[PDB]
Design a protein around this ligand. Structure first.
Ligand SMILES: [Mn+2]
Ligand SMILES: [Mn+2]
Length: 509
């Protein structure tokens, strides 16, 4: 104990946008942040596009963002890697993917492909899914696509062109493949142990169990829209005849992001699965995770992760320092394996506190979420003097911003601001240092002018970067997420490890 606290606050989904219209951050009462900015040095940093190793124009996200924050360097992203392999043709000869196809063919089964079907680019990309379908079709396989509909990394009603694209592909191999089922990502891609949701996707895939049937994918979507469902929440829909994932088939899950892929993957492959009582469990010829969703899941992986040495968490552990990771459960991955650079287990000296997210259908119903309890625990931790580094994620801006509901998003921002007043008080009393920042924007734009729909996605806006400490300082312009860890190490008066490539942004005065 008796340690000076260094606190990294990630206001998930809180960006800086000058425009006032539909800006829930500016509309919110943020007296603590306003006061902090008036007193303490503050700047803007970038968490989108090439600055975080993504294509120019691609919005940031929590996986890429927390990995960059923790790593102190820009990482080569799996999105890039897979896109490159498709471009060069290497994808189509990938031994793991080819093996899935050949094993299904040998068993006289089918290749079932599933994944988020949109151009969002956060968890998947439909062009990758086209590529996997083509890979299997060109090898003479029977192919069924199970589409998980988006509306969260894309506009809330936007699935139609994606479904049409895949229909058009299958039309080029007439009778050999088709879209079999559709369901919203709310069901298929849960990450907070809402197993009642996951079960709906699981039973659709394994039994063809559906709320509605339709003759075509687009007809299915029209039925969902008529039932007042948006893409994210589309109920289990079966197209045409039952096409079960059954014994001898192969499944390829085409998502490249881990957090929302773990639950449905476990439902298929985990030996003693306990999320829910499964009615049918197929013995697959192969189940492929496109990337490594979880080290302990016993299934082959197509694209294994690169080694990441001396992320901030690892490096502090190597120095015998202590650290806290704290968030609500919806952001578990973010403050654990995303921030740690891929490692799932605690480092020596690392403690985790995960507060259950509220047991509600959507977070516009409780925009304060579990932020107040997170704050209770964080303040206690800061005051204990037991931690050299404390990393907190506040989920609210991001999670409520994804609902597309402006008034709720305003309340989410207000909740975070109130909480930060208490964090500030504790840090100042302990003569500590704090960086308040974000991983990407979201809440600062709540209307999508390109579609006329509410805005449910991230933005490409810069994010705030506020330095709270015992003294003033100057902050260099042009910072990126990779600069945060070297900046923290400078505040801690600890040398930056060779593996970090970012720069210190802060000059104390
Ligand atoms: Mn985020
Ligand atoms: Mn988000």
């Amino acid at each position: 104990a008796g340690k000076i606290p260094h606190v990294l606050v990630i206001m998930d989904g809180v960006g800086h946008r000058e425009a006032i219209e539909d800006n829930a951050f500016l509309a919110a009462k943020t007296p603590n942040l306003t006061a902090m900015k008036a007193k303490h040095p503050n700047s803007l940093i970038s968490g989108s596009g090439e600055d975080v190793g993504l294509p120019d124009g691609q919005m940031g996200n929590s996986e890429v963002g927390h990995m960059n924050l923790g790593a102190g360097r820009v990482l080569y992203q799996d999105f890039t890697r897979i896109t490159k392999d498709i471009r060069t043709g290497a994808f189509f000869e990938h031994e793991v993917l080819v093996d899935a196809v050949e094993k299904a063919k040998a068993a006289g089964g089918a290749v079932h492909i599933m994944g988020l079907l949109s151009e969002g680019g956060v968890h998947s990309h439909e062009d990758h899914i086209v590529a996997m379908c083509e890979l299997a079709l060109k090898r003479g396989a029977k192919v069924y696509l199970h589409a998980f509909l988006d509306g969260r990394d894309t506009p809330p009603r936007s699935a139609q062109p994606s479904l049409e694209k895949l229909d058009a592909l299958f039309a080029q191999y007439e009778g050999k493949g088709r879209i079999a089922t559709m369901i919203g990502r709310y069901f298929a891609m849960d990450r907070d142990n809402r197993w009642d949701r996951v079960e709906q996707a699981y039973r659709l895939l394994t039994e063809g169990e559906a709320v509605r049937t339709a003759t075509t994918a687009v007809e299915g979507l029209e039925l969902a829209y008529a039932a007042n469902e948006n893409d994210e929440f589309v109920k289990a829909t079966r197209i045409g005849e039952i096409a079960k994932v059954q014994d001898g088939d192969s499944v390829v899950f085409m998502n490249f992001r881990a957090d929302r892929a773990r639950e449905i993957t476990r439902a298929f492959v985990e030996k003693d699965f306990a999320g829910f009582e499964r009615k049918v469990v197929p013995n697959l010829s192969k189940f492929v995770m496109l990337t490594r969703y979880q080290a302990s899941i016993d299934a082959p992986v197509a694209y294994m992760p690169e080694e990441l040495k001396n992320s901030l968490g690892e490096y502090l552990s190597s120095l015998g320092k202590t650290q806290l990771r704290i968030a609500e459960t919806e952001k578990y991955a973010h403050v654990t394996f995303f921030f740690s650079g891929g490692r799932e287990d605690e480092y020596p000296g690392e403690k985790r506190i995960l507060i259950p997210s509220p047991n509600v259908a959507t977070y516009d119903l409780k925009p304060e979420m579990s932020a107040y309890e997170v704050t209770d625990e964080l303040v206690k931790a800061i005051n204990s003097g037991e931690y050299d580094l404390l990393v907190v994620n506040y989920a609210n801006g991001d999670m409520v911003g994804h609902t597309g509901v402006f008034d709720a998003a305003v309340k989410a921002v207000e909740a975070v601001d109130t909480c930060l007043g208490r964090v500030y008080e504790a840090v100042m009393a302990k003569k500590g240092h704090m960086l308040i920042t974000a991983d990407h924007g979201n809440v600062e734009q709540m209307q999508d002018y390109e579609s006329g729909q509410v805005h449910t996605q991230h933005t490409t806006e810069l994010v705030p970067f506020i330095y709270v400490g015992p003294t003033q300082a100057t902050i260099a312009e042009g910072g990126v997420l990779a600069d945060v860890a070297p900046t923290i190490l400078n505040l801690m008066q600890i040398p930056v490890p060779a593996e970090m490539q970012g720069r210190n942004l802060i000059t104390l005065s």
